[PDB]
Amino acid sequence: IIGGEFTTIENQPWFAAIYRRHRGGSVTYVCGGSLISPCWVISATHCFIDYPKKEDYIVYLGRSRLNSNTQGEMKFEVENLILHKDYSADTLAHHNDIALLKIRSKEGRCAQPSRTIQTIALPSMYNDPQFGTSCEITGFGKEQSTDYLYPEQLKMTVVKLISHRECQQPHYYGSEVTTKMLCAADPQWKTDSCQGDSGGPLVCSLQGRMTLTGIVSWGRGCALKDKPGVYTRVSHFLPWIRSHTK
Ligand SMILES: COc1ccc2ccc(C(=N)N)cc2c1OCCCBr
Protein backbone atom coordinates (compact mmCIF):
# COMPACT_ATOMS: atom_id res chain seq x y z
CA ILE A 1 0.00 0.00 0.00
CA ILE A 2 1.32 3.41 -1.17
CA GLY A 3 0.24 6.11 1.30
CA GLY A 4 -2.85 5.40 3.39
CA GLU A 5 -2.48 4.41 7.04
CA PHE A 6 -0.99 1.73 9.26
CA THR A 7 -3.77 -0.38 10.73
CA THR A 8 -4.32 -3.60 12.74
CA ILE A 9 -6.24 -6.85 12.00
CA GLU A 10 -9.20 -5.94 14.24
CA ASN A 11 -10.10 -3.25 11.68
CA GLN A 12 -9.76 -5.70 8.69
CA PRO A 13 -10.73 -9.12 10.31
CA TRP A 14 -11.37 -10.96 7.02
CA PHE A 15 -7.76 -10.25 5.97
CA ALA A 16 -5.62 -13.34 5.31
CA ALA A 17 -1.78 -13.19 5.24
CA ILE A 18 -0.35 -15.84 2.85
CA TYR A 19 3.30 -17.00 3.02
CA ARG A 20 5.35 -19.67 1.24
CA ARG A 21 7.90 -22.11 2.76
CA HIS A 22 11.10 -22.47 0.66
CA ARG A 23 13.53 -25.47 0.54
CA GLY A 24 15.87 -24.80 3.48
CA GLY A 25 13.02 -23.58 5.70
CA SER A 26 12.87 -19.82 4.98
CA VAL A 27 9.37 -18.32 5.03
CA THR A 28 8.52 -15.32 2.78
CA TYR A 29 5.30 -13.34 2.39
CA VAL A 30 3.42 -14.01 -0.90
CA CYS A 31 0.00 -12.25 -1.11
CA GLY A 32 -3.11 -11.19 0.74
CA GLY A 33 -6.44 -12.96 0.76
CA SER A 34 -9.93 -12.71 2.27
CA LEU A 35 -11.87 -15.09 4.48
CA ILE A 36 -15.25 -15.75 2.74
CA SER A 37 -16.35 -18.68 4.98
CA PRO A 38 -14.55 -20.47 7.91
CA CYS A 39 -12.79 -23.03 5.55
CA TRP A 40 -12.28 -20.73 2.57
CA VAL A 41 -9.85 -17.96 1.72
CA ILE A 42 -10.22 -16.17 -1.65
CA SER A 43 -7.13 -14.68 -3.36
CA ALA A 44 -5.58 -14.32 -6.84
CA THR A 45 -4.27 -17.13 -9.10
CA HIS A 46 -1.10 -15.15 -10.16
CA CYS A 47 0.13 -15.36 -6.53
CA PHE A 48 0.43 -19.18 -6.83
CA ILE A 49 0.59 -20.24 -10.53
CA ASP A 50 4.43 -20.55 -10.55
CA TYR A 51 4.50 -22.47 -7.24
CA PRO A 52 1.28 -24.56 -7.39
CA LYS A 53 2.17 -26.92 -4.49
CA LYS A 54 -0.47 -26.42 -1.76
CA GLU A 55 1.96 -27.93 0.87
CA ASP A 56 4.29 -24.85 0.53
CA TYR A 57 1.71 -22.35 1.80
CA ILE A 58 1.05 -20.93 5.27
CA VAL A 59 -2.14 -18.89 5.85
CA TYR A 60 -2.65 -16.67 8.90
CA LEU A 61 -5.87 -15.05 10.14
CA GLY A 62 -5.91 -12.38 12.89
CA ARG A 63 -2.31 -11.38 12.06
CA SER A 64 -1.44 -7.60 12.10
CA ARG A 65 2.30 -7.72 11.50
CA LEU A 66 4.56 -9.34 8.93
CA ASN A 67 6.90 -10.94 11.57
CA SER A 68 4.97 -10.88 14.83
CA ASN A 69 2.63 -13.60 16.17
CA THR A 70 -0.38 -11.30 16.88
CA GLN A 71 -2.37 -12.27 19.99
CA GLY A 72 -5.45 -14.22 18.83
CA GLU A 73 -3.99 -15.13 15.41
CA MET A 74 -4.59 -18.58 13.90
CA LYS A 75 -2.20 -20.45 11.55
CA PHE A 76 -3.36 -22.78 8.72
CA GLU A 77 -2.16 -25.08 5.94
CA VAL A 78 -3.86 -25.30 2.58
CA GLU A 79 -6.02 -28.44 2.24
CA ASN A 80 -6.96 -27.51 -1.35
CA LEU A 81 -5.44 -24.88 -3.63
CA ILE A 82 -7.98 -24.12 -6.38
CA LEU A 83 -6.67 -22.06 -9.28
CA HIS A 84 -9.01 -20.75 -12.02
CA LYS A 85 -8.64 -23.08 -15.12
CA ASP A 86 -8.77 -20.08 -17.51
CA TYR A 87 -6.17 -17.87 -15.77
CA SER A 88 -3.66 -16.14 -18.11
CA ALA A 89 -1.29 -13.17 -17.95
CA ASP A 90 -0.72 -10.65 -20.71
CA THR A 91 2.01 -7.91 -20.44
CA LEU A 92 -0.23 -6.13 -17.91
CA ALA A 93 -3.66 -7.72 -17.84
CA HIS A 94 -4.24 -10.81 -15.64
CA HIS A 95 -7.35 -12.81 -16.61
CA ASN A 96 -9.55 -14.92 -14.30
CA ASP A 97 -7.16 -13.86 -11.55
CA ILE A 98 -8.98 -15.66 -8.73
CA ALA A 99 -8.08 -18.56 -6.45
CA LEU A 100 -9.58 -20.42 -3.54
CA LEU A 101 -7.60 -21.80 -0.61
CA LYS A 102 -9.35 -24.36 1.61
CA ILE A 103 -7.76 -23.84 5.05
CA ARG A 104 -7.12 -26.41 7.77
CA SER A 105 -5.37 -26.04 11.17
CA LYS A 106 -2.94 -28.82 12.30
CA GLU A 107 -5.95 -30.28 14.24
CA GLY A 108 -8.03 -30.28 11.03
CA ARG A 109 -10.24 -27.29 11.81
CA CYS A 110 -11.42 -24.31 9.81
CA ALA A 111 -11.30 -20.71 11.15
CA GLN A 112 -12.92 -19.88 14.49
CA PRO A 113 -14.60 -16.44 14.19
CA SER A 114 -13.52 -13.94 16.87
CA ARG A 115 -13.06 -10.18 17.32
CA THR A 116 -9.95 -10.37 15.05
CA ILE A 117 -11.14 -13.17 12.64
CA GLN A 118 -14.36 -12.59 10.64
CA THR A 119 -15.70 -13.45 7.20
CA ILE A 120 -16.41 -10.79 4.51
CA ALA A 121 -19.77 -11.05 2.68
CA LEU A 122 -19.68 -11.84 -1.04
CA PRO A 123 -21.40 -9.42 -3.51
CA SER A 124 -24.80 -10.02 -5.17
CA MET A 125 -24.87 -10.65 -8.93
CA TYR A 126 -25.29 -7.53 -11.21
CA ASN A 127 -25.04 -5.28 -8.12
CA ASP A 128 -21.61 -3.63 -7.84
CA PRO A 129 -21.26 -0.04 -6.48
CA GLN A 130 -21.48 2.92 -8.92
CA PHE A 131 -18.23 4.55 -10.19
CA GLY A 132 -17.01 7.18 -7.67
CA THR A 133 -17.89 4.96 -4.67
CA SER A 134 -15.15 4.97 -2.06
CA CYS A 135 -13.75 1.50 -1.21
CA GLU A 136 -10.96 0.24 1.01
CA ILE A 137 -7.92 -1.94 0.35
CA THR A 138 -5.64 -3.75 2.84
CA GLY A 139 -2.24 -5.33 2.53
CA PHE A 140 1.40 -5.87 3.46
CA GLY A 141 2.47 -4.67 -0.05
CA LYS A 142 5.21 -2.11 -0.88
CA GLU A 143 4.94 1.43 0.50
CA GLN A 144 6.94 2.75 -2.54
CA SER A 145 7.57 1.16 -5.97
CA THR A 146 11.35 1.53 -5.33
CA ASP A 147 11.21 -0.48 -2.04
CA TYR A 148 12.29 -4.16 -2.02
CA LEU A 149 11.10 -4.71 1.60
CA TYR A 150 7.45 -4.85 2.69
CA PRO A 151 6.09 -2.84 5.68
CA GLU A 152 6.23 -4.64 9.04
CA GLN A 153 2.79 -3.29 10.02
CA LEU A 154 -0.45 -3.94 8.05
CA LYS A 155 -1.69 -1.00 5.92
CA MET A 156 -4.99 0.17 4.50
CA THR A 157 -6.14 2.97 2.20
CA VAL A 158 -9.29 4.22 0.52
CA VAL A 159 -9.67 4.50 -3.28
CA LYS A 160 -12.56 5.39 -5.67
CA LEU A 161 -14.05 3.03 -8.27
CA ILE A 162 -13.52 4.07 -11.89
CA SER A 163 -16.01 3.16 -14.67
CA HIS A 164 -15.05 0.61 -17.36
CA ARG A 165 -15.46 3.39 -20.07
CA GLU A 166 -12.89 5.66 -18.29
CA CYS A 167 -10.56 2.76 -17.55
CA GLN A 168 -10.58 1.77 -21.27
CA GLN A 169 -9.42 5.30 -22.33
CA PRO A 170 -6.08 5.19 -24.30
CA HIS A 171 -3.95 6.91 -21.55
CA TYR A 172 -5.46 4.45 -19.00
CA TYR A 173 -5.51 0.77 -20.11
CA GLY A 174 -7.34 0.80 -23.46
CA SER A 175 -8.94 -2.55 -24.45
CA GLU A 176 -6.50 -4.43 -22.07
CA VAL A 177 -8.93 -3.93 -19.13
CA THR A 178 -12.17 -5.99 -19.51
CA THR A 179 -15.76 -5.99 -18.09
CA LYS A 180 -14.63 -8.82 -15.73
CA MET A 181 -12.22 -6.29 -14.11
CA LEU A 182 -12.81 -3.27 -11.87
CA CYS A 183 -10.59 -0.17 -11.77
CA ALA A 184 -10.09 1.85 -8.64
CA ALA A 185 -7.60 4.64 -7.74
CA ASP A 186 -6.94 7.89 -5.92
CA PRO A 187 -8.14 10.94 -8.07
CA GLN A 188 -4.80 12.58 -6.95
CA TRP A 189 -2.68 9.40 -7.72
CA LYS A 190 -1.07 9.55 -4.19
CA THR A 191 -2.40 6.31 -2.70
CA ASP A 192 -2.80 2.84 -4.20
CA SER A 193 -2.27 -0.91 -3.81
CA CYS A 194 1.18 -2.13 -4.97
CA GLN A 195 3.28 -5.32 -5.44
CA GLY A 196 2.65 -7.53 -2.36
CA ASP A 197 -0.99 -6.38 -2.05
CA SER A 198 -2.16 -8.90 -4.73
CA GLY A 199 -4.88 -11.32 -3.72
CA GLY A 200 -6.01 -8.86 -1.03
CA PRO A 201 -9.51 -7.35 -0.69
CA LEU A 202 -11.16 -4.35 -2.28
CA VAL A 203 -14.03 -3.85 0.23
CA CYS A 204 -17.02 -1.59 -0.63
CA SER A 205 -19.90 -0.64 1.66
CA LEU A 206 -22.97 -1.13 -0.56
CA GLN A 207 -26.51 -0.51 0.70
CA GLY A 208 -25.09 -0.48 4.28
CA ARG A 209 -23.26 -3.83 3.90
CA MET A 210 -19.45 -4.32 3.75
CA THR A 211 -18.82 -6.42 0.62
CA LEU A 212 -15.84 -8.15 -1.11
CA THR A 213 -16.26 -6.23 -4.37
CA GLY A 214 -12.78 -6.93 -5.70
CA ILE A 215 -9.46 -8.78 -5.38
CA VAL A 216 -6.15 -6.90 -6.03
CA SER A 217 -4.97 -8.18 -9.41
CA TRP A 218 -2.78 -5.90 -11.58
CA GLY A 219 -1.66 -2.40 -12.44
CA ARG A 220 1.03 -0.42 -14.26
CA GLY A 221 3.51 0.72 -11.59
CA CYS A 222 1.98 1.93 -8.27
CA ALA A 223 0.13 5.21 -7.64
CA LEU A 224 1.02 6.19 -11.24
CA LYS A 225 -1.00 8.93 -13.01
CA ASP A 226 -3.77 7.42 -15.24
CA LYS A 227 -2.81 3.88 -14.09
CA PRO A 228 -5.49 2.61 -11.67
CA GLY A 229 -5.29 -0.51 -9.59
CA VAL A 230 -7.15 -3.32 -11.45
CA TYR A 231 -9.21 -5.77 -9.39
CA THR A 232 -10.94 -9.08 -10.22
CA ARG A 233 -14.73 -8.30 -10.28
CA VAL A 234 -15.94 -10.79 -7.66
CA SER A 235 -19.66 -10.49 -8.77
CA HIS A 236 -18.73 -12.06 -12.16
CA PHE A 237 -17.24 -15.11 -10.41
CA LEU A 238 -20.14 -16.00 -8.07
CA PRO A 239 -21.02 -19.19 -10.13
CA TRP A 240 -17.31 -20.33 -10.08
CA ILE A 241 -16.95 -19.50 -6.31
CA ARG A 242 -20.18 -21.35 -5.42
CA SER A 243 -19.23 -24.39 -7.59
CA HIS A 244 -15.67 -24.67 -6.19
CA THR A 245 -16.65 -24.25 -2.50
CA LYS A 246 -19.39 -26.97 -2.67
C1 LIG B 1 4.39 -7.24 -9.57
O1 LIG B 1 3.88 -5.97 -9.14
C2 LIG B 1 2.50 -5.80 -8.98
C3 LIG B 1 1.52 -6.84 -8.90
C4 LIG B 1 0.18 -6.53 -8.74
C5 LIG B 1 -0.25 -5.20 -8.64
C6 LIG B 1 -1.64 -4.90 -8.44
C7 LIG B 1 -2.06 -3.61 -8.40
C8 LIG B 1 -1.11 -2.53 -8.55
C9 LIG B 1 -1.63 -1.11 -8.55
N1 LIG B 1 -0.97 -0.13 -9.28
N2 LIG B 1 -2.67 -0.93 -7.85
C10 LIG B 1 0.24 -2.79 -8.69
C11 LIG B 1 0.70 -4.13 -8.74
C12 LIG B 1 2.09 -4.47 -8.90
O2 LIG B 1 3.02 -3.46 -8.91
C13 LIG B 1 3.53 -3.12 -10.21
C14 LIG B 1 4.83 -2.34 -9.89
C15 LIG B 1 5.87 -3.21 -9.22
BR1 LIG B 1 7.16 -2.05 -8.18
mmCIF file of C-alpha atoms and ligand atoms in Angstrom:
data_model
loop_
_atom_site.group_PDB
_atom_site.id
_atom_site.type_symbol
_atom_site.label_atom_id
_atom_site.label_comp_id
_atom_site.label_asym_id
_atom_site.label_seq_id
_atom_site.Cartn_x
_atom_site.Cartn_y
_atom_site.Cartn_z
ATOM 1 C CA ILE A 1 0.000 0.000 0.000
ATOM 2 C CA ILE A 2 1.323 3.415 -1.169
ATOM 3 C CA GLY A 3 0.244 6.110 1.304
ATOM 4 C CA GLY A 4 -2.847 5.403 3.386
ATOM 5 C CA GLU A 5 -2.476 4.407 7.041
ATOM 6 C CA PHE A 6 -0.988 1.734 9.265
ATOM 7 C CA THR A 7 -3.771 -0.378 10.726
ATOM 8 C CA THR A 8 -4.325 -3.602 12.738
ATOM 9 C CA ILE A 9 -6.235 -6.848 11.999
ATOM 10 C CA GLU A 10 -9.196 -5.937 14.239
ATOM 11 C CA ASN A 11 -10.096 -3.248 11.677
ATOM 12 C CA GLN A 12 -9.761 -5.702 8.685
ATOM 13 C CA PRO A 13 -10.731 -9.116 10.305
ATOM 14 C CA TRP A 14 -11.368 -10.956 7.018
ATOM 15 C CA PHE A 15 -7.756 -10.245 5.971
ATOM 16 C CA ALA A 16 -5.618 -13.341 5.312
ATOM 17 C CA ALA A 17 -1.778 -13.188 5.241
ATOM 18 C CA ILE A 18 -0.350 -15.837 2.849
ATOM 19 C CA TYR A 19 3.299 -16.998 3.023
ATOM 20 C CA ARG A 20 5.354 -19.666 1.236
ATOM 21 C CA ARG A 21 7.901 -22.113 2.757
ATOM 22 C CA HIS A 22 11.104 -22.472 0.662
ATOM 23 C CA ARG A 23 13.526 -25.475 0.545
ATOM 24 C CA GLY A 24 15.873 -24.802 3.484
ATOM 25 C CA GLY A 25 13.019 -23.580 5.697
ATOM 26 C CA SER A 26 12.869 -19.823 4.983
ATOM 27 C CA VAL A 27 9.374 -18.323 5.026
ATOM 28 C CA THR A 28 8.516 -15.316 2.775
ATOM 29 C CA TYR A 29 5.299 -13.341 2.391
ATOM 30 C CA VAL A 30 3.417 -14.007 -0.900
ATOM 31 C CA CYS A 31 0.003 -12.250 -1.108
ATOM 32 C CA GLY A 32 -3.111 -11.188 0.745
ATOM 33 C CA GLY A 33 -6.438 -12.964 0.756
ATOM 34 C CA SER A 34 -9.926 -12.712 2.274
ATOM 35 C CA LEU A 35 -11.874 -15.092 4.485
ATOM 36 C CA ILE A 36 -15.249 -15.749 2.738
ATOM 37 C CA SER A 37 -16.353 -18.678 4.980
ATOM 38 C CA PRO A 38 -14.549 -20.468 7.907
ATOM 39 C CA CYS A 39 -12.794 -23.032 5.553
ATOM 40 C CA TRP A 40 -12.279 -20.733 2.567
ATOM 41 C CA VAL A 41 -9.849 -17.965 1.718
ATOM 42 C CA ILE A 42 -10.223 -16.173 -1.654
ATOM 43 C CA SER A 43 -7.133 -14.684 -3.358
ATOM 44 C CA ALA A 44 -5.579 -14.322 -6.835
ATOM 45 C CA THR A 45 -4.275 -17.133 -9.102
ATOM 46 C CA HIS A 46 -1.099 -15.154 -10.160
ATOM 47 C CA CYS A 47 0.132 -15.358 -6.531
ATOM 48 C CA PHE A 48 0.426 -19.179 -6.826
ATOM 49 C CA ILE A 49 0.593 -20.243 -10.531
ATOM 50 C CA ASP A 50 4.430 -20.552 -10.552
ATOM 51 C CA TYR A 51 4.502 -22.470 -7.238
ATOM 52 C CA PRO A 52 1.283 -24.556 -7.386
ATOM 53 C CA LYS A 53 2.169 -26.921 -4.487
ATOM 54 C CA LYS A 54 -0.469 -26.421 -1.756
ATOM 55 C CA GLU A 55 1.958 -27.927 0.873
ATOM 56 C CA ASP A 56 4.288 -24.847 0.529
ATOM 57 C CA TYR A 57 1.706 -22.353 1.803
ATOM 58 C CA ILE A 58 1.049 -20.930 5.269
ATOM 59 C CA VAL A 59 -2.136 -18.887 5.852
ATOM 60 C CA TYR A 60 -2.646 -16.669 8.902
ATOM 61 C CA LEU A 61 -5.871 -15.051 10.136
ATOM 62 C CA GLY A 62 -5.914 -12.376 12.891
ATOM 63 C CA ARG A 63 -2.305 -11.384 12.055
ATOM 64 C CA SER A 64 -1.436 -7.599 12.102
ATOM 65 C CA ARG A 65 2.302 -7.721 11.502
ATOM 66 C CA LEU A 66 4.561 -9.341 8.934
ATOM 67 C CA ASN A 67 6.902 -10.945 11.573
ATOM 68 C CA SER A 68 4.965 -10.882 14.835
ATOM 69 C CA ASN A 69 2.628 -13.605 16.171
ATOM 70 C CA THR A 70 -0.385 -11.299 16.880
ATOM 71 C CA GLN A 71 -2.374 -12.269 19.987
ATOM 72 C CA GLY A 72 -5.450 -14.218 18.825
ATOM 73 C CA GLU A 73 -3.985 -15.132 15.405
ATOM 74 C CA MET A 74 -4.593 -18.575 13.896
ATOM 75 C CA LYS A 75 -2.199 -20.448 11.550
ATOM 76 C CA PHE A 76 -3.357 -22.783 8.722
ATOM 77 C CA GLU A 77 -2.158 -25.079 5.941
ATOM 78 C CA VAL A 78 -3.856 -25.300 2.578
ATOM 79 C CA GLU A 79 -6.020 -28.437 2.239
ATOM 80 C CA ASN A 80 -6.956 -27.513 -1.350
ATOM 81 C CA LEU A 81 -5.445 -24.880 -3.630
ATOM 82 C CA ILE A 82 -7.975 -24.123 -6.385
ATOM 83 C CA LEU A 83 -6.667 -22.061 -9.277
ATOM 84 C CA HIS A 84 -9.014 -20.754 -12.023
ATOM 85 C CA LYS A 85 -8.642 -23.082 -15.121
ATOM 86 C CA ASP A 86 -8.770 -20.076 -17.511
ATOM 87 C CA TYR A 87 -6.172 -17.874 -15.771
ATOM 88 C CA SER A 88 -3.657 -16.143 -18.111
ATOM 89 C CA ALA A 89 -1.294 -13.171 -17.952
ATOM 90 C CA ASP A 90 -0.717 -10.654 -20.711
ATOM 91 C CA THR A 91 2.006 -7.908 -20.442
ATOM 92 C CA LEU A 92 -0.230 -6.129 -17.915
ATOM 93 C CA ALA A 93 -3.664 -7.718 -17.835
ATOM 94 C CA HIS A 94 -4.241 -10.812 -15.642
ATOM 95 C CA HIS A 95 -7.354 -12.814 -16.609
ATOM 96 C CA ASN A 96 -9.552 -14.922 -14.304
ATOM 97 C CA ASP A 97 -7.164 -13.860 -11.550
ATOM 98 C CA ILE A 98 -8.979 -15.660 -8.733
ATOM 99 C CA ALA A 99 -8.084 -18.555 -6.453
ATOM 100 C CA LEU A 100 -9.579 -20.417 -3.536
ATOM 101 C CA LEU A 101 -7.602 -21.801 -0.607
ATOM 102 C CA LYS A 102 -9.353 -24.357 1.615
ATOM 103 C CA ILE A 103 -7.765 -23.843 5.054
ATOM 104 C CA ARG A 104 -7.117 -26.412 7.766
ATOM 105 C CA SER A 105 -5.371 -26.035 11.165
ATOM 106 C CA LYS A 106 -2.944 -28.824 12.297
ATOM 107 C CA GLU A 107 -5.955 -30.278 14.238
ATOM 108 C CA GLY A 108 -8.026 -30.279 11.028
ATOM 109 C CA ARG A 109 -10.245 -27.286 11.815
ATOM 110 C CA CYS A 110 -11.419 -24.312 9.813
ATOM 111 C CA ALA A 111 -11.299 -20.712 11.151
ATOM 112 C CA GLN A 112 -12.916 -19.883 14.490
ATOM 113 C CA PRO A 113 -14.604 -16.445 14.185
ATOM 114 C CA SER A 114 -13.523 -13.944 16.873
ATOM 115 C CA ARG A 115 -13.063 -10.175 17.318
ATOM 116 C CA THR A 116 -9.946 -10.365 15.047
ATOM 117 C CA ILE A 117 -11.140 -13.166 12.635
ATOM 118 C CA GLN A 118 -14.364 -12.587 10.644
ATOM 119 C CA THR A 119 -15.695 -13.450 7.198
ATOM 120 C CA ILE A 120 -16.414 -10.786 4.514
ATOM 121 C CA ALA A 121 -19.766 -11.048 2.683
ATOM 122 C CA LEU A 122 -19.678 -11.839 -1.040
ATOM 123 C CA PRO A 123 -21.402 -9.424 -3.513
ATOM 124 C CA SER A 124 -24.800 -10.025 -5.174
ATOM 125 C CA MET A 125 -24.874 -10.646 -8.935
ATOM 126 C CA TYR A 126 -25.289 -7.528 -11.212
ATOM 127 C CA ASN A 127 -25.038 -5.278 -8.125
ATOM 128 C CA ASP A 128 -21.613 -3.633 -7.845
ATOM 129 C CA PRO A 129 -21.263 -0.040 -6.475
ATOM 130 C CA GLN A 130 -21.478 2.918 -8.918
ATOM 131 C CA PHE A 131 -18.233 4.548 -10.192
ATOM 132 C CA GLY A 132 -17.007 7.178 -7.675
ATOM 133 C CA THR A 133 -17.891 4.961 -4.666
ATOM 134 C CA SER A 134 -15.146 4.966 -2.060
ATOM 135 C CA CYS A 135 -13.746 1.498 -1.207
ATOM 136 C CA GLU A 136 -10.962 0.237 1.007
ATOM 137 C CA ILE A 137 -7.924 -1.945 0.349
ATOM 138 C CA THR A 138 -5.644 -3.746 2.838
ATOM 139 C CA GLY A 139 -2.244 -5.332 2.530
ATOM 140 C CA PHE A 140 1.396 -5.868 3.457
ATOM 141 C CA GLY A 141 2.473 -4.667 -0.046
ATOM 142 C CA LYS A 142 5.213 -2.106 -0.878
ATOM 143 C CA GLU A 143 4.940 1.428 0.498
ATOM 144 C CA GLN A 144 6.942 2.748 -2.539
ATOM 145 C CA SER A 145 7.573 1.164 -5.975
ATOM 146 C CA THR A 146 11.351 1.534 -5.330
ATOM 147 C CA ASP A 147 11.214 -0.477 -2.045
ATOM 148 C CA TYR A 148 12.289 -4.163 -2.022
ATOM 149 C CA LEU A 149 11.097 -4.706 1.598
ATOM 150 C CA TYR A 150 7.453 -4.848 2.693
ATOM 151 C CA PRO A 151 6.095 -2.843 5.678
ATOM 152 C CA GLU A 152 6.229 -4.644 9.041
ATOM 153 C CA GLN A 153 2.789 -3.285 10.019
ATOM 154 C CA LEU A 154 -0.452 -3.945 8.048
ATOM 155 C CA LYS A 155 -1.685 -0.995 5.920
ATOM 156 C CA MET A 156 -4.993 0.172 4.501
ATOM 157 C CA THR A 157 -6.143 2.967 2.201
ATOM 158 C CA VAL A 158 -9.290 4.218 0.520
ATOM 159 C CA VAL A 159 -9.665 4.500 -3.285
ATOM 160 C CA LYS A 160 -12.559 5.387 -5.670
ATOM 161 C CA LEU A 161 -14.050 3.033 -8.272
ATOM 162 C CA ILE A 162 -13.516 4.065 -11.890
ATOM 163 C CA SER A 163 -16.013 3.162 -14.672
ATOM 164 C CA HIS A 164 -15.048 0.607 -17.364
ATOM 165 C CA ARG A 165 -15.458 3.389 -20.075
ATOM 166 C CA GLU A 166 -12.888 5.664 -18.291
ATOM 167 C CA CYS A 167 -10.562 2.763 -17.552
ATOM 168 C CA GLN A 168 -10.585 1.770 -21.266
ATOM 169 C CA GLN A 169 -9.418 5.303 -22.326
ATOM 170 C CA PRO A 170 -6.078 5.185 -24.299
ATOM 171 C CA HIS A 171 -3.954 6.911 -21.549
ATOM 172 C CA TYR A 172 -5.464 4.455 -18.995
ATOM 173 C CA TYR A 173 -5.510 0.768 -20.115
ATOM 174 C CA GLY A 174 -7.340 0.798 -23.463
ATOM 175 C CA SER A 175 -8.943 -2.548 -24.445
ATOM 176 C CA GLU A 176 -6.497 -4.433 -22.074
ATOM 177 C CA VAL A 177 -8.933 -3.928 -19.131
ATOM 178 C CA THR A 178 -12.175 -5.987 -19.511
ATOM 179 C CA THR A 179 -15.764 -5.986 -18.090
ATOM 180 C CA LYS A 180 -14.626 -8.823 -15.734
ATOM 181 C CA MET A 181 -12.221 -6.295 -14.108
ATOM 182 C CA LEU A 182 -12.813 -3.268 -11.872
ATOM 183 C CA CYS A 183 -10.590 -0.175 -11.767
ATOM 184 C CA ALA A 184 -10.091 1.846 -8.644
ATOM 185 C CA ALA A 185 -7.603 4.638 -7.736
ATOM 186 C CA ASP A 186 -6.943 7.889 -5.919
ATOM 187 C CA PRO A 187 -8.139 10.938 -8.074
ATOM 188 C CA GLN A 188 -4.804 12.584 -6.949
ATOM 189 C CA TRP A 189 -2.681 9.404 -7.715
ATOM 190 C CA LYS A 190 -1.068 9.548 -4.188
ATOM 191 C CA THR A 191 -2.397 6.306 -2.698
ATOM 192 C CA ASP A 192 -2.802 2.840 -4.202
ATOM 193 C CA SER A 193 -2.273 -0.908 -3.812
ATOM 194 C CA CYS A 194 1.184 -2.126 -4.967
ATOM 195 C CA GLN A 195 3.283 -5.318 -5.444
ATOM 196 C CA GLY A 196 2.648 -7.532 -2.364
ATOM 197 C CA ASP A 197 -0.994 -6.384 -2.052
ATOM 198 C CA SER A 198 -2.161 -8.895 -4.726
ATOM 199 C CA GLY A 199 -4.880 -11.324 -3.723
ATOM 200 C CA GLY A 200 -6.013 -8.863 -1.030
ATOM 201 C CA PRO A 201 -9.509 -7.351 -0.686
ATOM 202 C CA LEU A 202 -11.155 -4.354 -2.276
ATOM 203 C CA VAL A 203 -14.033 -3.850 0.227
ATOM 204 C CA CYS A 204 -17.021 -1.591 -0.634
ATOM 205 C CA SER A 205 -19.896 -0.644 1.661
ATOM 206 C CA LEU A 206 -22.968 -1.133 -0.565
ATOM 207 C CA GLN A 207 -26.513 -0.509 0.703
ATOM 208 C CA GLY A 208 -25.087 -0.480 4.279
ATOM 209 C CA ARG A 209 -23.258 -3.835 3.897
ATOM 210 C CA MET A 210 -19.447 -4.316 3.746
ATOM 211 C CA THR A 211 -18.821 -6.420 0.625
ATOM 212 C CA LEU A 212 -15.840 -8.149 -1.111
ATOM 213 C CA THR A 213 -16.264 -6.234 -4.367
ATOM 214 C CA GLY A 214 -12.784 -6.928 -5.699
ATOM 215 C CA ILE A 215 -9.460 -8.783 -5.380
ATOM 216 C CA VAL A 216 -6.155 -6.895 -6.029
ATOM 217 C CA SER A 217 -4.970 -8.184 -9.405
ATOM 218 C CA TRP A 218 -2.782 -5.902 -11.580
ATOM 219 C CA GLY A 219 -1.660 -2.402 -12.443
ATOM 220 C CA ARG A 220 1.028 -0.419 -14.263
ATOM 221 C CA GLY A 221 3.514 0.719 -11.594
ATOM 222 C CA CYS A 222 1.983 1.929 -8.268
ATOM 223 C CA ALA A 223 0.129 5.213 -7.636
ATOM 224 C CA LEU A 224 1.017 6.195 -11.245
ATOM 225 C CA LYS A 225 -1.004 8.929 -13.014
ATOM 226 C CA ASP A 226 -3.766 7.417 -15.238
ATOM 227 C CA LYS A 227 -2.809 3.879 -14.094
ATOM 228 C CA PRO A 228 -5.493 2.609 -11.674
ATOM 229 C CA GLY A 229 -5.291 -0.514 -9.592
ATOM 230 C CA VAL A 230 -7.147 -3.316 -11.449
ATOM 231 C CA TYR A 231 -9.213 -5.768 -9.393
ATOM 232 C CA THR A 232 -10.940 -9.075 -10.218
ATOM 233 C CA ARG A 233 -14.730 -8.299 -10.277
ATOM 234 C CA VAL A 234 -15.940 -10.790 -7.661
ATOM 235 C CA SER A 235 -19.656 -10.489 -8.767
ATOM 236 C CA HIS A 236 -18.725 -12.063 -12.160
ATOM 237 C CA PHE A 237 -17.240 -15.107 -10.409
ATOM 238 C CA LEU A 238 -20.141 -15.997 -8.073
ATOM 239 C CA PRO A 239 -21.024 -19.186 -10.131
ATOM 240 C CA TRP A 240 -17.312 -20.328 -10.079
ATOM 241 C CA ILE A 241 -16.953 -19.497 -6.306
ATOM 242 C CA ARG A 242 -20.181 -21.350 -5.420
ATOM 243 C CA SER A 243 -19.233 -24.393 -7.594
ATOM 244 C CA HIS A 244 -15.672 -24.669 -6.193
ATOM 245 C CA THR A 245 -16.645 -24.252 -2.498
ATOM 246 C CA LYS A 246 -19.387 -26.966 -2.667
HETATM 247 C C1 LIG B 1 4.392 -7.242 -9.572
HETATM 248 O O1 LIG B 1 3.880 -5.973 -9.139
HETATM 249 C C2 LIG B 1 2.504 -5.797 -8.979
HETATM 250 C C3 LIG B 1 1.523 -6.836 -8.899
HETATM 251 C C4 LIG B 1 0.183 -6.528 -8.744
HETATM 252 C C5 LIG B 1 -0.245 -5.198 -8.637
HETATM 253 C C6 LIG B 1 -1.636 -4.903 -8.438
HETATM 254 C C7 LIG B 1 -2.064 -3.611 -8.402
HETATM 255 C C8 LIG B 1 -1.108 -2.525 -8.550
HETATM 256 C C9 LIG B 1 -1.634 -1.111 -8.546
HETATM 257 N N1 LIG B 1 -0.973 -0.133 -9.279
HETATM 258 N N2 LIG B 1 -2.673 -0.929 -7.850
HETATM 259 C C10 LIG B 1 0.235 -2.786 -8.688
HETATM 260 C C11 LIG B 1 0.698 -4.133 -8.737
HETATM 261 C C12 LIG B 1 2.092 -4.465 -8.897
HETATM 262 O O2 LIG B 1 3.015 -3.464 -8.915
HETATM 263 C C13 LIG B 1 3.530 -3.116 -10.214
HETATM 264 C C14 LIG B 1 4.834 -2.335 -9.895
HETATM 265 C C15 LIG B 1 5.869 -3.209 -9.215
HETATM 266 BR BR1 LIG B 1 7.156 -2.045 -8.178
#
